Write an enzyme that holds these catalytic residues in place. Structure first.
Site, PDB file in Angstrom:
ATOM      1  N   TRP A 172       0.871  -1.179   0.000  1.00 12.91           N
ATOM      2  CA  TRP A 172       0.000   0.000   0.000  1.00 12.91           C
ATOM      3  C   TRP A 172       0.918   1.242   0.000  1.00 12.91           C
ATOM      4  CZ3 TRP A 172      -2.652   2.951   4.451  1.00 12.91           C
ATOM      5  CH2 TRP A 172      -3.720   3.678   3.933  1.00 12.91           C
ATOM      6  N   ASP A 224      -1.398  -6.080   9.016  1.00 19.62           N
ATOM      7  CA  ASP A 224      -2.390  -5.210   8.418  1.00 19.62           C
ATOM      8  C   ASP A 224      -3.505  -6.026   7.739  1.00 19.62           C
ATOM      9  OD1 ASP A 224      -3.665  -2.950   7.283  1.00 19.62           O
ATOM     10  OD2 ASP A 224      -2.017  -2.549   5.932  1.00 19.62           O
ATOM     11  N   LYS A 256     -13.961  -2.020   4.277  1.00 25.35           N
ATOM     12  CA  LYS A 256     -14.173  -2.842   3.074  1.00 25.35           C
ATOM     13  C   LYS A 256     -15.248  -3.928   3.271  1.00 25.35           C
ATOM     14  CE  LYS A 256     -10.070  -1.032   1.746  1.00 25.35           C
ATOM     15  NZ  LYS A 256      -8.604  -0.934   1.830  1.00 25.35           N
TER      16      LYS A 256
HETATM   17  C1  NOP Z   1      -7.942  -0.045   2.442  1.00 18.72           C
HETATM   18  C2  NOP Z   1      -6.616  -0.262   3.089  1.00 18.72           C
HETATM   19  C3  NOP Z   1      -6.144   0.502   4.199  1.00 18.72           C
HETATM   20  C4  NOP Z   1      -6.879   1.664   4.762  1.00 18.72           C
HETATM   21  O1  NOP Z   1      -7.966   1.352   5.608  1.00 18.72           O
HETATM   22  P1  NOP Z   1      -9.041   2.392   5.917  1.00 18.72           P
HETATM   23  O2  NOP Z   1      -8.444   3.436   6.764  1.00 18.72           O
HETATM   24  O3  NOP Z   1      -9.501   2.841   4.596  1.00 18.72           O
HETATM   25  O4  NOP Z   1      -9.959   1.499   6.612  1.00 18.72           O
HETATM   26  C5  NOP Z   1      -4.950   0.228   4.747  1.00 18.72           C
HETATM   27  N1  NOP Z   1      -4.174  -0.746   4.265  1.00 18.72           N
HETATM   28  O5  NOP Z   1      -3.112  -0.859   4.801  1.00 18.72           O
HETATM   29  C6  NOP Z   1      -4.580  -1.504   3.217  1.00 18.72           C
HETATM   30  C7  NOP Z   1      -3.685  -2.597   2.708  1.00 18.72           C
HETATM   31  C8  NOP Z   1      -5.802  -1.252   2.618  1.00 18.72           C
HETATM   32  O6  NOP Z   1      -6.204  -1.957   1.544  1.00 18.72           O
END
Ligand code: NOP
Ligand code: NOP
Lengths: 396, 396
Positions: free
Chosen positions: A130, A211, A246
């Site tokens: 990310w 994560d 999500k």
């Molecule tokens: C979507 C996503 C995030 C961020 O999460 P939110 O703050 O929008 O809930 C963080 N990380 O690390 C990953 C891998 C994501 O796909």
């Protein structure tokens, strides 16, 4: 004061959304940010969360401040979702979780915590990862180093290069693992590869930071938490940053958790007062509505049942969209074999598109992908599948 | 990793709430945290926000991510509330506001911004001030120095000592001002004293940071924004951190704003991309529900009318509770003259109670006040007024 402040570069994921929407070409396709879309091109608010919201509207008496760590109910359900009902860390009162504004807020609270209460100088993050991982950890003071991860020729996890990479990680360094649905690759360790990594951070002395943004989207909620539970059975200390943006379609309410585990309940609660002191020095206490909804849905036999079916429909529609996309690409003239994206997990397809294939696709076909070649498969529908594949094969 | 992490001290405001609730003495009185209570000892969720919530429940289609800076509607209404409808900074497109998780989140985003994009090393904060100011600014890297403020003998603002204090502040230093309802004193500058301070930060080169948590609680919404507007007419650059937790009774939804003003729209938008890059590296985008409600109420002629009356009832009930408390104290045997607390603004009474008068009051009468002698007048009702005054005069 602000005269020679340079303008920041635009965000590689979010900057897309600014450009997409300012474009007034009628047939444009978004594929950027990583929000689920249903068959009709829309991100409805789930029905399980609309019922839970009606409920809070009938049943709330106050908006008075949540504790620094939020709703306790939210905390134990998150721990059960992550570690399993009747897990040993739950029972030994080894974990402590704080409700946070999304997974980003949980990742920063972790970073702030570790920076002022720990020895850590280095967080290790995968290549690729990310894009905002680096930015959250550098803002806390931490350095971010990279470990190998994806074999691009073979489209696999390059486990050996991931092992040899990390042999330059010291005892005391943080190593960030994505729990399942690796963003951006969608390539995850097998269980056997995760219990190998479980064992290796144990004699190397790495602190694991998991994560979890997409639990429920690779195989299922419990199936997706297996790697972390393989680490949890072995480690005295972990930290997991979890998001419900999500799997609950609750993107803008910002519901996540930073959950801390130490060797015993005394240490975990001592460490947790510092993590709570970091949370107070940033925002004060977490936003209630979104977490309030997760906890109502997970506390209700019926309303939980309805969410789990809503989450299964999404998992399945993205899988359907994957096969469709590799099939359509094929018959639309596809120049390469894209069958590898079938084996990837989650919302994304890490296509091999170069930064220029990706630039040409936005600037003349209007299909928006991230500059890494990450495309959101959950943003594809049977109606936009053909426009989209005709665009990719003309840039190939 | 976490073996020699010391336990943090408890929060002086929030740590009270932990102790209060764990106490199972039946007649205890809270007076700690600074949440409004109505005549019946309760913090209801306002009616204007329950109507707005029914509305969002009927009218929302998605929970898809807000922009990094949130709801634009929220942004312009906040600017109008702060600067006035048809203000010159609104018209010159000189201000940019980001929606944030409460006023604390707006204060940190400011601190993070200034730390990586500015020369500032020092934030000046009043003595006394909100206890968490120091903690938010030190977490960003900034040093916090103190300026004189309250004359305790005379119970006044000590304007001269405030002037001579600040003559040790350099050009380029941040000076934090509370807009109205100074927490903890409730003593505010007169308009004439604010246009004197307006003029002085102009030739001294201080950057003004206004903290606004209680707009609508001293004289009224426009009357309360006069000091800031006296600074805004004179300054090329300001920043205000605003909260809607108190005046909207929306405490746990976490709705606030960090609004940036620079000399012109180009500079303000350049500076704002950095402030938005700081916001992304912390949480990602703001929680929607609470801000969504402020903006529905402020966008509706009727629903706004209903809120403004709800906010006036609170302003008035606290004023009623003040006179009651100085009257009751009098006839309950009061050892000193407490008539000075009549002249204070907002939810609080900065009583002269010593840390031990305050410790004895919790530990034997069960009335909870902050260790500074700050007591929440909005937590007093005609039913608990007598218990409470009998407790204070037995500790005097
Ligand atoms: C979507 C996503 C995030 C961020 O999460 P939110 O703050 O929008 O809930 C963080 N990380 O690390 C990953 C891998 C994501 O796909
Ligand atoms: C209440 C309050 C705050 C915190 O605002 P929220 O985050 O709860 O909205 C901040 N400051 O600075 C003062 C003076 C307050 O009274």
């Amino acid at each position: 004061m602000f005269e020679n402040i340079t303008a920041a570069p635009a965000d590689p994921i979010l900057g897309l959304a600014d450009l997409f929407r300012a474009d007034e070409r009628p047939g444009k396709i978004n594929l950027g940010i990583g929000v689920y879309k249903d068959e009709t091109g829309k991100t409805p608010v789930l029905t399980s969360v609309k019922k839970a919201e009606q409920y809070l509207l009938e049943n709330e008496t106050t908006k008075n401040y949540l504790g620094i760590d939020g709703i306790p109910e939210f905390g134990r359900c998150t721990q059960e979702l992550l570690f399993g009902k009747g897990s040993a860390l739950i029972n030994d009162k080894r974990a402590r979780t704080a409700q946070t504004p999304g997974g980003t807020g949980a990742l920063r609270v972790a970073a702030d915590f570790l920076a002022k209460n720990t020895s850590v100088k280095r967080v290790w993050v995968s290549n690729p990862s990310w894009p905002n991982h680096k930015s959250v950890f550098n803002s806390a003071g931490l350095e971010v180093r990279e470990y190998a991860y994806y074999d691009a020729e073979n489209h696999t996890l390059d486990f050996d290069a991931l092992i040899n990479s990390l042999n330059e990680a010291q005892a005391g360094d943080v190593v960030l693992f994505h729990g399942c649905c690796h963003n951006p690759t969608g390539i995850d360790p097998t269980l056997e590869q995760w219990q190998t990594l479980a064992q290796l951070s144990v004699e190397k002395g790495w602190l694991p930071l998991f994560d979890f943004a997409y639990q429920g989207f690779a195989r299922g909620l419990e199936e997706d938490a297996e790697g972390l539970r393989a680490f949890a059975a072995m480690h005295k200390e972990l930290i997991v940053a979890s998001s419900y943006s999500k799997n609950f379609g609750l993107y803008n309410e910002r519901v996540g958790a930073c959950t801390l585990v130490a060797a015993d309940s005394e240490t975990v609660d001592r460490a947790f007062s510092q993590m709570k002191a970091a949370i107070r020095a940033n925002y004060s206490n977490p936003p209630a509505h979104g977490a309030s909804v997760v906890a109502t849905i997970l506390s209700n036999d019926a309303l939980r049942a309805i969410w789990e079916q809503e989450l299964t429909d999404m998992r399945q529609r993205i899988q359907r969209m994957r096969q469709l996309f590799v099939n359509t690409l094929q018959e639309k003239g596809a120049n390469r074999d894209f069958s590898f994206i079938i084996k990837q997990n989650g919302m994304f397809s890490f296509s091999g598109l170069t930064k220029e294939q990706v630039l040409r696709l936005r600037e003349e076909f209007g299909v928006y992908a991230v500059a890494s070649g990450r495309v959101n498969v959950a943003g594809m529908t049977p109606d936009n599948m053909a426009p989209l594949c005709e665009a990719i094969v003309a840039v190939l």
